Amino acid sequence: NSNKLDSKHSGNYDYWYRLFRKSKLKPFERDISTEIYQAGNKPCKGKG
Amino acid sequence: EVFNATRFASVYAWNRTRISNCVADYSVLYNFAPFFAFKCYGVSPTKL
Ligand SMILES: *[C@@H]1O[C@H](CO)[C@@H](O[C@@H]2O[C@H](CO)[C@@H](O)[C@H](O)[C@@H]2O)[C@H](O)[C@H]1NC(C)=O
Ligand SMILES: *[C@@H]1O[C@H](CO)[C@@H](O)[C@H](O)[C@H]1NC(C)=O
Structure with missing residues (x-):
């Protein structure tokens, strides 16, 4: 536990995580990329 | 219509639909x- 270095009054949101990937992550692979996950059939590039 | 429902029943009466001819x-x-x-047990979710 380390809620003394990942915490402060008024909050912090420095950390990040990925819920949206085109496939699973194979063992020991990094996937640093910011690509909007597709829904339906739209080539959409944007949030919403 | 099993994921778009509104009243997924309580666990005391587990609603059981049948999916066939599809x-x-x-x-x-x-x-x-x-x-x-x-968590899939009998099958791998990738190969479904
Ligand atoms: C479980 O819940 C499903 C979604 O509500 C039901 O499927 C539908 O039920 C409606 C009536 O509410 C039907 O008109 C429709 O054709 C479809 O079957 C399903 O019946 C229900 N199952 C049980 C056992 O309650
Ligand atoms: C349920 O159906 C409505 C009908 O328009 C749809 O907008 C909504 O996204 C559906 N939600 C789920 C969880 O299936």
Whole structure:
């Protein structure tokens, strides 16, 4: 536990995580990329 | 219509639908739910 270095009054949101990937992550692979996950059939590039 | 419902019954009466005579593309099953647990036992979810 380390809620003394990942915490402060008024909050912090420095950390990040990925819920949206085109496939699973194979063992020991990094996937640093910011690509909007597709829904339906739209080539959409944007949030919403 | 099993993921678009409104009154998924309580566990004391587990609603049991039957799915037959159909083509099962689980990609739609992957769209109506930001999963928290896809634990598959008999089959691998990738090969469904
Ligand atoms: C479980 O819940 C499903 C979704 O509500 C039900 O499927 C539908 O039920 C409606 C009636 O509410 C039907 O008109 C429709 O054709 C479809 O079957 C399902 O019946 C229900 N199952 C049980 C056992 O309650
Ligand atoms: C349920 O059906 C409505 C009908 O318009 C749709 O907008 C909504 O996205 C559906 N939600 C789920 C979780 O299936």
